[PDB]
Design a protein around this ligand. Sequence first.
Ligand SMILES: Cc1cc2nc3c(=O)[nH]c(=O)nc-3n(C[C@H](O)[C@H](O)[C@H](O)COP(=O)(O)OP(=O)(O)OC[C@H]3O[C@@H](n4cnc5c(N)ncnc54)[C@H](O)[C@@H]3O)c2cc1C
Length: 448
Amino acid sequence: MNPKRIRALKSGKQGDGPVVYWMSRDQRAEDNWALLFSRAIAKEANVPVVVVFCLTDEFLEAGIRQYEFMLKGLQELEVSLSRKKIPSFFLRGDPGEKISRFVKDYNAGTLVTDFSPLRIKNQWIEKVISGISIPFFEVDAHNVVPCWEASQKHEYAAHTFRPKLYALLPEFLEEFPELEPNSVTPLSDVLETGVKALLPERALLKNKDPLFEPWHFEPGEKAAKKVMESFIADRLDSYGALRNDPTKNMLSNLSPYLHFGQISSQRVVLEVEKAESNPGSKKAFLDEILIWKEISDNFCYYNPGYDGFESFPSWAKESLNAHRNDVRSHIYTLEEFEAGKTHDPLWNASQMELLSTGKMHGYTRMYWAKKILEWSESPEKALEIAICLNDRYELDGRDPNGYAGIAWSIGGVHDRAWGEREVTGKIRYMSYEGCKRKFDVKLYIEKY
Ligand SMILES: Cc1cc2nc3c(=O)[nH]c(=O)nc-3n(C[C@H](O)[C@H](O)[C@H](O)COP(=O)(O)OP(=O)(O)OC[C@H]3O[C@@H](n4cnc5c(N)ncnc54)[C@H](O)[C@@H]3O)c2cc1C
């Protein structure tokens, strides 16, 4: 219960009501600081617990794959808080006017939410702050070290962020106190109408069969843990050597759960540190879930235009500007990129994995984004196309890891300058021939 995990969004006078947890990013009962700190606040005020979820009007911008993944985990979530005597109230509409109305109707005393450096959360936060009179608090329940505490300034590279983050690990890498149930307390239809409005935009093939295959990742808190145990037991030892081979499913497969907050990265880090495996593989994994994941929150928190060309490092901006006018080898529209109708079969195979499974392998996710920059009229058009394709079809999309990852591939964020080349400039280059010498491309293409 470190007080450094909490910050004040609006200082006011708490009323005689239940501490209302506005769950947005961490959709889990266990291992949730915001839920834990809300319970502590409610206990110190002799007040019950309150959990509120908002079903925003922005779910039409995504597919059924994300809607069903989040909604199915909500059903498991609701029965989980019921066992803890914690009622769950789910609202549909704008968070700005629905959270404010809820606080007035239920006479809530204190409002608490989880942290999200994305632009949408800030848009919702400003609306709620202007329509409430109760104190509003926010808890960083997604990062092992709080985003504002890891660093006070945007970090240029993982070389400069790793020593800072590991310094605060002994203070902040701790276990989760048990969630105390309430002493006393006072989706199927919603899901059905959501998919009915999302059916016309569902991805279909020539024979009109659905593209998405939903058996690859079962949503829910229970399934997220089971993926964690299987990764550690069977797929952690070989992670260091085979994490760059798409043909092998050596990855943890925890990104869809981590994005929706169905499992805490802290518990994953706690479990992998206790487990015994190859030291190189262990360090490679913590380098991904701790260093590169949390720098994404740092990148989005300290860069207002994190999804724009303005957030690129100056060496990349000058290099891309000097090679703006080079004649591109090929140009592809958004529709051509979407259907996978390019001249590169590796790119087409990666896009097919994205369309079918909803989760593209991390190694090819660097090839997939960089080739978009190669075959785009401008770097800005590459950013727009990559972001749209990422957020539309990825189960882990609309996440700070996505925008930091896209900026890494296109704008060189958290990278260094490489050999100068036409069109792409000094940005890191990955070729089809290069991938052939790293992994068997043929098996990847045939699979998808
Ligand atoms: C262009 C591009 C876009 C991306 N968009 C997303 C996205 O929308 N959502 C998303 O969750 N990930 C994104 N990633 C980051 C990364 O690719 C994924 O986290 C990772 O591939 C997911 O696979 P995994 O977690 O099952 O396996 P693992 O390799 O074991 O990843 C474990 C965890 O480490 C983190 N991680 C791994 N690689 C990275 C990385 N390059 N940057 C930041 N964190 C990382 C992830 O949080 C991940 O959960 C993107 C990467 C790129 C290159």
